[PDB]
Amino acid sequence: HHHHHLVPRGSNPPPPETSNPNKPKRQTNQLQYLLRVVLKTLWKHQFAWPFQQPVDAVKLNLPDYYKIIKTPMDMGTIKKRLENNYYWNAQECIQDFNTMFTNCYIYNKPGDDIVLMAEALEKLFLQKINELP
Ligand SMILES: COc1cc2c(cc1NS(=O)(=O)c1cc(Br)ccc1OC)OC(C)(C)C(=O)N2
Numbered sequence: 001h002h003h004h005h006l007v008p009r010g011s012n013p014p015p016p017e018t019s020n021p022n023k024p025k026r027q028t029n030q031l032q033y034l035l036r037v038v039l040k041t042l043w044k045h046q047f048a049w050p051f052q053q054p055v056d057a058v059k060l061n062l063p064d065y066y067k068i069i070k071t072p073m074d075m076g077t078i079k080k081r082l083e084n085n086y087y088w089n090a091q092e093c094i095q096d097f098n099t100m101f102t103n104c105y106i107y108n109k110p111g112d113d114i115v116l117m118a119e120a121l122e123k124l125f126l127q128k129i130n131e132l133p
Contacts, residue, residue: 012055012057012066013066015054015072018086019084019086020086025085025087026087026088030132030133031082031085033133034090034094035082035083038097038128039078041124042124042125045121047117047121048075048121050114050117051074051075051117052075052076053074054072054076054077055072055074069103069107071103072103073097073099078096078100097125101121101122104118105118
């Protein structure tokens with residue numbers, strides 16, 4: 001038999017939503033700070049790049065990534081959610097950051113370069129969180 005299962009291929013899943021008209025939303029002091037200070041300082045950091053977009057498991061040759069990580073999250077998605085006023089409160093946005101960091105610590109090994117990057121970003125995140133209004 002000449003079917004060698006070379007197709008169909010893998011793919012990335014659809015990315016998290018960044019819009020949802022029926023989701024409850026608010027603008028709050030805390031959410032404005034989350035965009036203007038928290039997200040924008042992490043985004044500009046030289047360790048941000050692995051976290052600036054949904055994980056492209058196809059490009060990165062990480063075929064196990066979406067087998068292990070079932071609640072993906074990234075700063076591109078968070079940025080867009082903040083820009084779109086998607087959240088109801090600060091907790092929803094903070095939880096997204098916490099999911100992103102937790103995913104990184106699940107997927108990778110302590111001491112890995114990616115983990116060193118997440119640790120540094122998480123330290124900065126926690127510092128900025130402490131000055132939330
Ligand atoms: C092993 O390659 C990677 C592992 C991760 C990763 C990216 C890669 N591949 S890579 O080419 O971006 C890469 C980044 C660093 Br830092 C070190 C080695 C890498 O690939 C070998 O980012 C995410 C998906 C957020 C992750 O949690 N882990």
